[PDB]
Structure formats: structure tokens, C-alpha cells
Structure 1
Amino acid sequence: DFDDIHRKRMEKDLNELQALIEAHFENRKKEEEELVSLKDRIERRRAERAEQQRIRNEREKERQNRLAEERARR
């Protein structure tokens, strides 16, 4: 009947809608994976900046202390 075709129509509506729902699920999921990898390389960047900054500061403090002891000796 009209109820039958209406039921089939809302049925295929539910089907296409859940299909697109799972689809954008997958899409946003890939995007979240990409963003997680971004965060991971970000923390890699944090660690590398930290170590290189610390190396720079080590050399700087070495220099400053050497100059300071030279001053104190003079």
C-alpha cells in the first residue's frame, strides 16, 4: 500500500543516512588519526627543541661562567 512504499522509502532513507553516518565516521576518524600523528610529531618537535635549546644554554652557561671566573681572577 501507500504505507508499504512509505515504509520502503523511509527504510532506504535510514539506510543511506546510516551509510553516510558511518562514512563521516570514517572520514573524521582518518582526520583524527592524522591529528594524532600531528600531535606525535609535535611532541617530537617539543623534545628536539628542548634538547637543542638545552645544548645552546649549556654552551652559553659554560661561556658565561668562564668569562665570570676570568673577571673574578682579574
Structure 2
Amino acid sequence: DFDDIHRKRMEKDLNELQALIEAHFENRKKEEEELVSLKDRIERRRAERAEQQRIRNER
């Protein structure tokens, strides 16, 4: 009936919506991984700046 096609329509709506939901989940997840790697290289930069600054200060 009209209820049947309405149900199938909201069904495929839910399907595409959860699909895009998981999709942006994955996208923002990759972005968070990239940002974590950024933080890691950032702490590497902090450590290297600290050691070279300390060497400069020692001399």
C-alpha cells in the first residue's frame, strides 16, 4: 500500500543516512588519526627543541 512504499522509502532513507553516518565516521576518524600523528610529531618537535635549546644553554 501507500504505507508499504512509505515504509520502503523511509527504510532506504535510514539506509543511506546510516551509510553516510558511518562514512563521515570513517572520514573524521582518518582526520583524527592524522591529527594524532600531528600531535606525535609535535611532541617530537618539543623534545628536539628542548634538547637543542638545552645544548645551546649549556654552551
Q: Same fold (TM over 0.5)?
A: yes
Deviation at 1:34, TM superposition (A): 0.0
Count of aligned positions: 59
Distance (whole Å) between structure 2 residues aligned to residue 30 and residue 3 of structure 1: 40
Moved segments of 4+, more than 2 Å = none
Deviation at 1:36, TM superposition (A): 0.0
Distance (whole Å) between structure 2 residues aligned to residue 27 and residue 37 of structure 1: 15
Distance (whole Å) between structure 1 residues aligned to residue 30 and residue 6 of structure 2: 36
Deviation at 1:17, TM superposition (A): 0.0
Is residue 31 of structure 2 the alignment partner of residue 38 of structure 1?
no
Structure 1 counterpart of 2:11: 11
Alignment of 1:1-74 (within 5 A): 1-57=1-57
Identify unmatched segments of 5+ residues in structure 1. Answer: 58-72
Deviation at 1:26, TM superposition (A): 0.0
Distance (whole Å) between structure 1 residues aligned to residue 31 and residue 4 of structure 2: 40
Deviation at 1:5, TM superposition (A): 0.0
Deviation at 1:52, TM superposition (A): 0.0
TM-score between both structures, scaled by the size of structure 1: 0.77
Q: What RMSD, in angstroms, separates the aligned Cα atoms of the two structures?
A: 4.0
